[PDB]
């Protein structure tokens, strides 16, 4: 059931087409049944719609770094070389999602804040998340020899996952110290959650397709000196 040969390339090759064909039919129902059919709120008017671009890009900004924790735990204690590569396969995608979350938060707060950049808990947390992703990516693109950069990235990812709750719950209180209040109340309205659940599920599928595509590129980036790639 798990004897991973260099068939992972041929295993996640049948699943990239249909997980990309069906990852755009779920996004264009999470972005067309919203963004044009969901009524707008009172306080923000027709701007309470960057939810679909910021919330799915923030849930899966930390939902992939918690998926690189498993991709580093399995690749460390069981000492698997292939699974360890997953740590290096989901890092650029997580970094892009964090950057998108920052951009969307900045564009969503500008109507209300008055300036593009203010330091908030839900925003500084994503900023430090981007910093950790950048650390992972920079560490991976530093070793000249592979099979060592992967393990170093796994160790760093484990350390960052250990530190993540502490950092998040420290920023959540640092916000309470100075500002002392929260900006928006936790409410989504009933006929705005299904169009947002659709978008979250679509962003889940796009990330899976992207990480499969990046994994197919990283397998050939380490096994390029074997006769298996004669084809």
């Amino acid at each position: 059931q798990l004897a991973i040969p260099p068939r992972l390339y041929q295993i996640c090759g049948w699943f990239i087409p249909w997980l990309a064909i069906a990852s755009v039919v779920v996004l264009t129902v999470g972005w067309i049944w919203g963004f044009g059919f969901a009524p707008a709120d009172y306080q923000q008017g027709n701007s309470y719609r960057i939810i679909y671009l910021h919330v799915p890009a923030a849930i899966w900004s930390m939902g992939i770094y918690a998926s690189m924790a498993v991709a580093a735990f399995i690749g460390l204690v069981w000492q698997m070389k292939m699974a360890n590569l997953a740590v290096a396969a989901m890092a650029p995608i997580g970094a892009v999602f964090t950057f998108i979350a920052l951009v969307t938060g900045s564009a969503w707060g500008k109507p209300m804040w008055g300036t593009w950049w203010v330091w908030d808990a839900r925003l500084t947390s994503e900023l430090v998340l981007l910093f950790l992703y950048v650390g992972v990516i920079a560490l991976w693109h530093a070793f000249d020899d592979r099979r060592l950069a992967g393990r170093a990235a796994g160790i760093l990812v484990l350390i960052g996952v250990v530190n993540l709750p502490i950092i998040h719950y420290s920023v959540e209180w640092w916000n309470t110290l100075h500002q002392g209040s929260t900006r928006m109340q936790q409410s989504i309205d009933p006929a705005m959650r299904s169009p947002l659940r659709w978008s979250i599920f679509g962003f889940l599928l796009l990330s899976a397709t992207l990480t499969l595509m990046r994994m197919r590129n990283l397998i050939l980036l380490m096994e390029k000196r074997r006769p298996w790639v004669s084809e």
């Binding site: 393990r151 170093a152 530190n163 502490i166």
Partner: protein, 220 residues
């Protein structure tokens, strides 16, 4: 091969590496001195910004000093420690970290009365600053040990090591500044020191093992 022998050896080596263990102290002093003159003679603004700038300078000085935790040993005697000294590698890393703190954290802690006097901090403010430096710089060493252990073979110095180690020090910095700012109006500050002692224990009972694995990866 014993723990104390390694500690004394590293203390002896660090002293002959002078003019490089004193650069972080000079950076600390320059950063502490620059801001009071940049903003001019303003009592309230300087008094409000001192708790933050002090710890920012301390963190930057610790980061500057961390570059030599394992770098020099890699070109020669980074082995003879994994390969010998049946004392477990986490214990060797612990000795390294304690020696580094003795060479870096203790010098920062020892001039605290002078820094407090220069910045106008009262006796209570100095007490809180010393108590948070005693529980803060060992945390810096334990947090920066894995980063320098991973980076030692890379010798991509400065930017990379900072990118690895600085984000991990966010709670320490935040709680240290909160603790000192709680001493500005002289309200009691003990709950903010518990969150520092617990974090110090957590980073002292989990970093040596992570740093051991990082060193094992780097050596190979």
């Amino acid at each position: 091969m014993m723990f104390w022998r390694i500690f004394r050896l590293e203390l002896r080596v660090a002293f002959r590496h002078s003019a490089e263990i004193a650069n972080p102290l000079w950076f600390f002093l320059i950063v502490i001195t620059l801001f009071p003159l940049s903003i001019g003679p303003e009592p309230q603004l300087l008094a409000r910004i001192a708790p933050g700038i002090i710890w920012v300078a301390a963190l930057l000085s610790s980061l500057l000093a961390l570059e030599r935790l394992f770098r020099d040993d890699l070109q020669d005697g980074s082995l003879e420690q994994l390969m010998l000294l049946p004392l477990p590698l986490p214990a060797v890393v612990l000795a390294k970290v304690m020696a580094h703190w003795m060479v870096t954290g203790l010098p920062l802690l020892i001039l605290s009365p002078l820094v407090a006097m220069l910045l106008g901090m009262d006796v209570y403010g100095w007490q809180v600053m010393a108590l948070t430096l005693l529980l803060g710089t060992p945390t810096l060493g334990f947090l920066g040990a894995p980063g320098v252990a991973l980076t030692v073979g890379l010798k991509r110095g400065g930017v990379l090591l900072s990118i690895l180690v600085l984000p991990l020090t966010i709670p320490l910095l935040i709680f240290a500044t909160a603790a000192m700012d709680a001493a500005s109006m002289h309200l009691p500050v003990d709950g903010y020191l518990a969150i520092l002692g617990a974090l110090l224990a957590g980073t002292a009972t989990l970093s040596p093992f992570a740093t051991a694995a990082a060193l094992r990866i780097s050596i190979q």
